[PDB]
Design a protein around this ligand. Structure first.
Ligand SMILES: *C(=O)[C@@H](NC(=O)[C@H](N)c1ccccc1)[C@@H]1N[C@@H](C(=O)O)C(C)(C)S1
Length: 260
């Protein structure tokens, strides 16, 4: 197509490896660029963890109100919210909000522990039909993003298909799906990524990701006004370990997609 040429041109101008997957839910067509290649998810895998706890809430009705201790030894590299409740407690609802809207790594590790380890997160992915998603490590070592390392990776095709079933499909209950949609719309970390390349009248819920080798990710569900919703995944990684983040590439990919 024409989007393929411009995405390939954007990737050439960036010096890195770009992966894009779009699903238009009006006709279920797919716009893929390197859609079957493996990319490090970094903190875009947090959506899987929050959705798995939400799935647990379908049986444990009062699970999200359960308090969880935040002790100093739980602190890691980036804890913007959990820093404020040390020697106190946060409920699983506020931990999911801290993980999704502020990318709190301590909040993520608390979701992983609630699920019985990273194997419990991958289990939820297989239970909803995702055979590519694999979580192998806790935060922050899941952000190492070594080239060729299969740990903590997924493909754009699989992540877009899964994100649709969670936010638009019916892998979750209504209260759970609406709670996940509300969380993603309140994200505070994606102003410079997918959101920066979309028409400002479009409402977006998204989750960003960052890691070593300049890894810059963003997955998003997009509601255009007067049009069926869309799902967009943008993965980007770079050859140099000390590479700087490239959120501008994610915006440019979204603009190329939105024009399509
Ligand atoms: C996952 O994406 C997380 N990233 C990390 O833990 C990295 N070790 C890191 C990268 C850059 C600065 C500090 C730590 C969290 N999610 C990122 C994001 O959404 O962009 C993050 C920078 C907020 S940290």
């Amino acid at each position: 197509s024409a989007v393929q040429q411009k995405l390939a041109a954007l990737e050439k101008s960036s010096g890195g490896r770009l992966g894009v997957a779009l699903i238009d839910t009006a006709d279920n067509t797919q716009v893929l660029y390197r859609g079957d290649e493996r990319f490090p998810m970094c903190s875009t895998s947090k959506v899987m963890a929050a959705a798995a706890v939400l799935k647990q809430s379908e049986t444990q009705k009062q699970l999200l109100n359960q308090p969880v201790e935040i002790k100093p030894a739980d602190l890691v590299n980036y804890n913007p919210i959990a820093e404020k409740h040390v020697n106190g407690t946060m409920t699983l609802a506020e931990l999911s909000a801290a993980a999704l809207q502020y990318s709190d790594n301590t909040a993520m590790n608390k979701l992983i522990a609630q699920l019985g380890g990273p194997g419990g997160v991958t289990a939820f992915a297989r239970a909803i039909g995702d055979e590519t998603f694999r979580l192998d490590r806790t935060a922050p070592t899941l952000n190492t993003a070594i080239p060729g390392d299969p740990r903590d990776t997924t493909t754009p095709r699989a992540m877009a298909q899964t994100l649709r079933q969670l936010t638009l499909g019916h892998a979750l209950g209504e209260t759970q799906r609406a709670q996940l949609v509300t969380w993603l719309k309140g994200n505070t970390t994606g102003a410079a990524s997918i959101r920066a390349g979309l028409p400002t009248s479009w409402t977006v819920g998204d989750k960003t990701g960052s890691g070593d080798y300049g890894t810059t990710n963003d997955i998003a569900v997009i509601w255009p006004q007067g049009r069926a919703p869309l799902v967009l995944v943008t993965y980007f990684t770079q050859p140099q370990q000390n590479a700087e983040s490239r959120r501008d590439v994610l915006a440019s990919a979204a603009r190329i997609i939105a024009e399509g």
